[PDB]
């Protein structure tokens, strides 16, 4: 398609596609068209057409615009909330946080590189999955397929999964907490008292 | 404390954040056990590890606070800075926001009219799009 | 005679260490820490309608680590307890969901909030 | 566009025509013609343009001709990586760095060799592969001469354990490396691995490995007391003293700011000399180590 | 122990030359008696011996040689 | 019920299954005549698999010495 024919379409891959798309999209006359549909639709296709009008009248109103969708920049961790602290003997203790930072730095770093010289469409191009794929597990580690298993005995953890379950920030750090001059010990009866 | 508005953070908002960028995956160098220079846990970027105390040398006092030494760049001030501070990474190529997609649609929302089967091929670089047409032009 | 001794299991704590990622004090007796309030004891004191106590028991007693010095010291000198600041689990929280690009903003009802 | 991306990776890798001696002697020559192309090119001396075009279609045909050979070695990489998977870096992250090392190694081939690409190419993949391993595979990163160090003690330590059928000495072990026992015992320390803080605490649930270490930075209320009242009582007790010398001495000891000023450096606000000041900070001194002033200061050491 | 190293069949390459036959395993007394072990923070183990023979049809040699894998607690 | 017998002989089975991949590697990557029974075998695996047996392992539980009927149980 490219060679037979040039200057008229142009066409990408990967969540640069996205941004470009996004970038450029009309949700005004989207918008228009589904109510248009919904005016005048039968079946599951009306209730297709009402998601689509629920989220882009979401976006329309809001003043945030979508494409908020793709990140460029990736924020990080304060160090203290991902302490590297030092243990006694000689040891280490880190967080899972700082071993996915490091892979997607890595693989940012690799990524420049590859670009910074001539080199192929192949290469770059997976290269460029597995950012996205660095980036996905560092924000939600087993969303799709097998997880970073890290040192391959436990899941890593991840900046959701802090956020979410028994164990998460909301219900065991924030609703729950442990409390200062308090105590605890067996009871006994005093009919007494 | 009124109300807390949430929303998409777009890459301007992430630079505003950030007080520097990250160039390194280095966290402490095995020797000194001190943080390394542009890379995690850096000083220079995040806060100094120790209170008042910068990296190079040259200010180890609480008296003249809040200067930034042109040695290492580590702004003086209280240890719990580290805690607040944060940084960011830019990336060479964009990435999407795991959370939006990949889930039901009343957060990815068909925002485009494709299926995920679609954006799961496109994203992951296994086919392509066409991003614009002149189809005017191809008419004409 | 069981192994279920009274000795073992008395543990007591005016205050004593604290936890590195979340300022609340630690768990466990070995390390002198303060014991948990749930979820159900949380809603057991909403349910008498206590709201200060509630609050102390949520601000200033752990997780403010402003807050835990000045009552030290309000106590030791007399003087009345002090108004209890935010906690830092909810600046965690905050920092964190603004690592997931959410930029959360805490405003006022006029413009920006005094924090 | 699946799970596990090795195996969709693989299959980019596709069907491919791999080279026989003769394709690629021709594929390195028309290399060549297209580096000889555009060093024509890059020369400031006018080129009339249809031979410019022509230098620049040889040149593109030279860098297909690279693209045929990186696409052909792709597979020679993965089974490269494949033979030092399993050391900290994930097994596509290895085949990524192989294939920066093929890249070198090709744009550093050529056909001057009489030998097979094959040959030439897996020193600069396991060179590409060995340093991305120091460089990256641990959390502490380790310099490469301290990588190749510490992987050198302990490929020994396990072929002495392997002959001698025991945990060998530390100063057997000394003697091997012939470096002394100091140097022994820092590269034995300097190749540990952090342990993370988010598993299990070795019952079912109960929370995990950060939350039963206390921190040092955290302000322990009881000193924080403590050294305020300490603070009160040294304030009121320099009160007692005169107003002149209380001033004085709190300046040579800082007790207002952080730095406490020398003697002279006392001696200039004050408008006193460098040896009037040091005779009454003696005085203040003296009149703080009696008895009187003493008794409650003991207790707060 | 004899049976998962019979179930080990000797290792044939590609050209299938060579081979390796684990044929026997054996013991011997530990070296730190229980309350040593006990006291000093040590794994209560003996060592385990097997005799690895070696034998290649383009040498046509047989090789046989002690081999030991390790502390068996 | 597999016995102490048959939990301790499956960890050696993987660890000796290990130890063959380890060799075939070996043989693989060497030269005939250089091949010997002593200097093939790598005694990592097994070793390192008997002992992340016994240690971090749930069927290898912690003795509780309350009373000999508590052993016994
Ligand atoms: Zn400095």
Known sequence: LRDRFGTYFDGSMGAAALQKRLESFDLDEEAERLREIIRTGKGQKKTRALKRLKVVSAFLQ?????????????????????????????????????????????????????????????????????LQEAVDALFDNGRRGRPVTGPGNRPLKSLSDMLKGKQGRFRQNLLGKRVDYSARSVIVVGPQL | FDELRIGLATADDIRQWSHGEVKKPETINYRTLKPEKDGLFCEKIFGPTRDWECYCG???????????????????????????????????????????????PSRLGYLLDLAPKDLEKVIYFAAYMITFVDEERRTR | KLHHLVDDKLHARSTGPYSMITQQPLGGKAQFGGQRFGEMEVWALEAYGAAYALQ????????????????????????????????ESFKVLIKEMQSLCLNVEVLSSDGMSIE | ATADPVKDYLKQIGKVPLLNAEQEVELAKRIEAGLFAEDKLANSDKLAPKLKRE?????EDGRRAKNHLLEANLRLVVSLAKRYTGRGMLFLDLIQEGNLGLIRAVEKFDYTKGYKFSTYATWWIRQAITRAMADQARTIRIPVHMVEVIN????????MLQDLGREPTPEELAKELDM????????????????????????????????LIEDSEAVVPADAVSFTLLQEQLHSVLDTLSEREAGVVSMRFGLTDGQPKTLDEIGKVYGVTRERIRQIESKTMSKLRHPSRSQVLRDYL | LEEIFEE????????????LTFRDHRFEPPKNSIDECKDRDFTYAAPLFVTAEFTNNETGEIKSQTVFMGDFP | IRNVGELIQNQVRTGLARMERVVRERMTTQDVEAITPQTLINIRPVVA???????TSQLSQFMDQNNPLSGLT
């Open chain 6, 49 to 55: 698999s008997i002992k992340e047996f016994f240690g």
């Open chain 4, 152 to 159: 050198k003690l302990a490929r020994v330590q396990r072929q």
């Open chain 5, 8 to 19: 080990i069949s000797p290792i044939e390459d590609f050209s299938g030359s060579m081979s």
């Open chain 1, 62 to 130: 809001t003043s945030n615009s979508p494409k908020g969708m793709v990140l460029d920049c990736v924020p990080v961790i304060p160090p203290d909330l991902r302490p590297m602290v030092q243990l006694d003997g000689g040891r280490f203790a880190t967080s899972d946080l700082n071993d996915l930072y490091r892979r997607v730095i890595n693989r940012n770093n690799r990524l420049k590189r590859l670009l910074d010289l001539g080199a192929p469409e192949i290469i770059v191009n997976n290269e460029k999955r597995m």
């Open chain 4, 55 to 59: 230098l620049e279609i040889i040149a």
């Open chain 3, 56 to 87: 102390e028991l949520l601000t200033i007693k752990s997780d403010d680590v402003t807050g835990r010095v000045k009552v030290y010291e309000a106590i030791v000198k007399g003087e009345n307890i002090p108004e209890p600041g935010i906690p």
């Open chain 2, 58 to 104: 040259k200010y180890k006092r609480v008296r003249f606070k809040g200067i930034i030494c042109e040695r290492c760049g580590v702004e003086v001030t209280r240890a719990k800075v580290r805690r607040e501070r944060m940084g960011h990474i830019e990336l060479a190529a964009p990435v999407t926001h795991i959370w939006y997609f990949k889930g039901v």
């Open chain 4, 180 to 211: 002394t026992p100091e140097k022994v015992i820092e590269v034995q320390k300097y190749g540990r691995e952090p342990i993370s803080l988010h598993t299990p605490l070795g019952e079912d649930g109960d929370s995990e490995f950060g939350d």
